[PDB]
Design a protein around this ligand. Structure first.
Ligand code: MG
Ligand code: MG
Ligand code: MG
Ligand code: MG
Ligand code: MG
Ligand code: MG
Ligand code: MG
Ligand code: MG
Ligand code: MG
Ligand code: MG
Ligand code: MG
Ligand code: MG
Ligand code: MG
Ligand code: MG
Ligand code: MG
Ligand code: MG
Ligand code: MG
Ligand code: MG
Ligand code: MG
Ligand code: MG
Ligand code: MG
Ligand code: MG
Ligand code: MG
Ligand code: MG
Ligand code: MG
Ligand code: MG
Ligand code: MG
Ligand code: MG
Ligand code: MG
Ligand code: MG
Ligand code: MG
Lengths: 32, 115, 67, 233, 134
RNA sequence: GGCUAACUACGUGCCAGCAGCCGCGGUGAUACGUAGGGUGCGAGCGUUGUCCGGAUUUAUUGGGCGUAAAGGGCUCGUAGGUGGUUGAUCGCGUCGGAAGUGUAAUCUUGGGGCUUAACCCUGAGCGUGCUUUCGAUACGGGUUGACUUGAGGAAGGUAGGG
RNA sequence: UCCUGACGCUGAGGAGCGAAAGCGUGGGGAGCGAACAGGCUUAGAUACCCUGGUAGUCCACGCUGUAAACGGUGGGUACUAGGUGUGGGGUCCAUUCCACGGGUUCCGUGCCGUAGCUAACGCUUUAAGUACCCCGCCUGGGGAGUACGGCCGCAAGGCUAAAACUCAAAGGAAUU
RNA sequence: AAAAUGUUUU
């Protein structure tokens, strides 16, 4: 493994988790 | 040396060096060398005139050449098959193959005398 | 290596018996390592357990400190 | 030959081998008795194998005969050279180098260079004057070439067979020999391989005389064959 | 656990032949003995023998002694199991397999006992294609 | 231009444009445009669309999973798949005959007719199966009985931060 | 030695267990220490470093069910050179009539290494070799383990799991 | 002991 693959997946996951954190309230008001 | 049963391969073989797999089967006279460039060059230099060769695995020329080489080295000439099995060629090997070997040898005799 | 440290035999361990436990406790009061005490694994385990029991039960010092 | 059968072998101590620490597994059939750790050669089939080696060297000398006596161990340094010089048979004794058997062109070039220098250096040192550190360095190069090359002088072409002592030390010789398809006859103890030797002679290889009697008997065989070549011609 | 004793026989023979062993041994079964017999009759092994149990005292032991020619040359170029327990292969009298262009032999269990392809074709009988020994 | 059979000049100057991929064009462009020459085909020749091939690139024939994409975090266990040695028996799988059927055309092939061919007629094969029926019993399976070597248990011995 | 007499293996779905962090109720709280406050460094320092320091770390009962949960190597079985450490149970030998020692046998656990395998690195009886049985999984790189739906959860989230679009590479080992 | 960066040629 070149660790680059893990870094790419790491950034994608971290960005999605940040999106979930910032939109936590709206999802529980109407949605998942 | 490569065992030719009358201008064709003795029996089907599958060779592989590294990753270059090459399949060879004998063909009826007049079929030609149905082979890819590198394997076809190897067979044409070896003198096989009726053969069906397929290149499985990697297409690198060097590795395909080595795979054709050990596929040909895996060939097992009928007399030495008989020696291996402790029997006779008439007892081990197909009558059609032996016959075709005689007609090839005799046509060879014709060519030699004509010279 | 460790074969030159010949295997030593002790028989019964008997945490009450302070003589063997003193022979296997270090001059500072610690338990000696296996490669220096020359014991089998089972005998070393029994000696360590007996030393701990004697320590808790006042027959041996937890650390002899000053020599 | 007869070599008084097993009497000479037992008196010399050929039956000695190596202990259990290191061993070639292809010696399972070749086990007599586990005596004091050192493995024991039965020394019975040894007579048959040395007889077969004698027969092959007779056949090789009948077809003309060129045996290269290769040796490097301190137990054979002072033994190989004397018998090889007595029989007039090519030998190498110090630092069998990578090549020779495969570097034929380079080694022949060095043979010609040694042949010319062995005359021109002597002529220059005995005749016209010459400055120091030039004649000295040419003489030193001559000495190094003489040390690293002995009986290799006399070979017109590729040899016919190679005689190996302590194949573990002289491993490269057998690789070159198998690459160029020359017959090999070698002393092998309980740690060597029969796959890389065609005419295999088991026996000890750690004593000076243990290889010395074998090299002497094969030297006698070579001398007898060279004598018979006069009538063979 | 053991699933295909015939495949075990074939792999034992292949491994022993590759390692240049003179003899190989295995627990005995009737079909194993038959295959060993036809292997001997076709010249792929030197001989075979069924031994009454005397070490484990439990069951018969089938032992195959192999043959290597001049300059230590394999008499078996390979052996392959065809009718696997997971997927069984049956061949008709007309669709009998050819091994190594006819140089090798397929071992076929027919209704008339174990018969090499050549035999079966002569008798016009098919069956279960056990092996492709060549 | 290469794959791909067949090259030069003039014009243009990352412009105009080309391209299926690699790429070409920035001032000596065999890759753009034209011309000469050439090459492949030819009453056709190209382009686009679609399908199969090449692609073993879903691998039954015929692939893989340490690091290339790929071993479930681990175990228990249901259905299912699979089964050590051997006697007897059934004859479902399997194998071999027989009968029936698989229209014709198509397709393969032997003859024949259109001036040849395409096309057409005709004989056979094929129709890779199915049903019925008669056999074979080596193997798979069913039924049934043994054997202990796999597996489990008893008794004794026994190691351990389970 | 004894007993049973193939009772075996694997196992979709399902169920349970599952580091740490996290969550709920209650308790506890020395040390440590996200967040936080201050001091330094710095162009800035929402950091490294320093002084403080709350959740947490701990306990009870639940929940969550994820890890580079890795040997990145599913389980079972048979076979295929050795060499050499070490852990466990036997048994044998000589002097003992202990044990030191050697063997030998059965089961672990390392290292070296042959055949063989692999793109190479390497693996090599603890296989990544030769084979058979069953399960899980892969099919270019991104988009994406994301959206929609559904299930699970108190929540965090987990599980199942695309497509449009886009690139002609992404990648493995090794060489200089 | 901390001590950053390196557009578009043709
Ligand atoms: Mg491959
Ligand atoms: Mg061209
Ligand atoms: Mg121009
Ligand atoms: Mg396909
Ligand atoms: Mg396509
Ligand atoms: Mg693939
Ligand atoms: Mg696997
Ligand atoms: Mg991966
Ligand atoms: Mg795992
Ligand atoms: Mg899971
Ligand atoms: Mg079941
Ligand atoms: Mg069975
Ligand atoms: Mg029966
Ligand atoms: Mg018709
Ligand atoms: Mg006509
Ligand atoms: Mg029809
Ligand atoms: Mg049955
Ligand atoms: Mg018990
Ligand atoms: Mg009973
Ligand atoms: Mg679950
Ligand atoms: Mg916790
Ligand atoms: Mg809490
Ligand atoms: Mg609380
Ligand atoms: Mg701090
Ligand atoms: Mg872990
Ligand atoms: Mg994983
Ligand atoms: Mg599993
Ligand atoms: Mg496995
Ligand atoms: Mg072990
Ligand atoms: Mg692999
Ligand atoms: Mg999700």
């Amino acid at each position: 493994g070149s660790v680059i693959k893990k870094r790419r997946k790491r950034m994608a996951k971290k960005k999605h988790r940040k999106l979930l954190k910032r939109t936590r309230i709206q999802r529980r008001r109407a949605g998942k | 040396k490569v065992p030719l049963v009358g201008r064709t391969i003795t029996h089907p073989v599958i060779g592989e060096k590294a990753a270059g797999v090459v399949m060879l089967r004998p063909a009826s006279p007049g079929t030609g060398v149905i082979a890819g460039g590198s394997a076809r060059a190897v067979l044409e230099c070896a003198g096989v005139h009726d053969v069906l060769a397929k290149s499985l695995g990697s297409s690198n020329a060097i590795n395909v050449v080595h795979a054709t080489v050990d596929a040909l080295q895996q060939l097992e000439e009928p007399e030495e098959v008989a020696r291996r099995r402790g029997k006779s060629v008439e007892d081990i090997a197909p009558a059609a193959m032996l016959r075709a070997r005689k007609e090839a040898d005799e046509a060879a005799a014709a060519a030699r005398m004509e010279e | 290596k460790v074969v030159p440290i010949k295997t030593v035999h002790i028989g019964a361990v008997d945490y009450k018996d302070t003589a063997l436990l003193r022979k296997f406790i270090s001059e500072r009061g610690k338990i000696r390592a296996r490669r220096v005490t020359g014991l089998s694994v089972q005998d070393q385990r029994k000696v360590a357990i007996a030393i701990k029991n004697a320590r808790e039960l006042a027959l041996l010092p937890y650390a002899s400190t000053a020599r | 030959m007869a070599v008084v059968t097993t009497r000479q072998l037992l008196e010399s101590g050929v039956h000695f081998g190596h202990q259990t620490r290191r061993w070639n597994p292809k010696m399972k059939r070749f086990i007599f008795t586990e005596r004091n750790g050192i493995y024991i050669i039965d020394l019975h089939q040894s007579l048959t194998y040395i007889d077969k080696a004698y027969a092959f060297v007779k056949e090789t000398v009948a077809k003309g005969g060129q045996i290269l006596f290769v040796g490097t161990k301190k137990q054979a340094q002072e033994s190989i050279v004397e018998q090889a010089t007595r029989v007039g048979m090519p030998y190498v004794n110090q630092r069998w180098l990578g090549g020779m058997l495969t570097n034929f062109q380079t080694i022949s070039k060095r043979i010609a260079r040694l042949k010319e220098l062995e005359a021109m250096d002597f002529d220059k040192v005995s005749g016209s004057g010459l400055t120091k550190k030039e004649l000295l360095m040419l003489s030193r190069e001559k000495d190094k070439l003489e040390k690293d090359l002995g009986g290799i002088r006399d070979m017109p072409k590729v040899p016919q067979a190679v005689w190996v002592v302590d194949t573990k030390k002289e491993h490269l010789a057998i690789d070159e020999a198998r690459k160029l398809k020359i017959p090999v006859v070698a002393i092998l103890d309980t740690n060597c391989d029969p796959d890389e030797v065609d005419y295999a002679i088991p026996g000890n290889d750690d004593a000076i005389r243990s290889v010395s009697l074998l090299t002497r008997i094969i030297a006698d065989a070579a001398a007898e064959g060279l004598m018979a070549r006069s009538a063979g011609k | 656990t053991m699933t295909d004793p015939i495949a075990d026989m074939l792999t034992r023979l292949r491994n022993a032949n590759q390692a240049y062993h003179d003899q190989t041994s295995m627990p005995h079964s009737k079909i194993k003995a038959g295959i060993a017999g036809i292997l001997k009759s076709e010249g792929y092994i030197a001989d075979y023998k069924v031994n009454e149990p005397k070490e484990g005292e439990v069951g018969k032991t089938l032992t195959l002694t192999l043959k290597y020619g001049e300059n230590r040359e394999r008499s078996i170029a390979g052996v392959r199991r065809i009718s696997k327990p997971g997927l069984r292969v049956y061949a008709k009298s007309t669709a009998l397999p050819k091994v190594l262009g006819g140089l090798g032999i397929a071992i076929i269990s027919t209704s008339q006992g174990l018969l090499t392809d050549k035999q079966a074709h002569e008798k016009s009988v098919g069956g279960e294609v056990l092996a492709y020994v060549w």
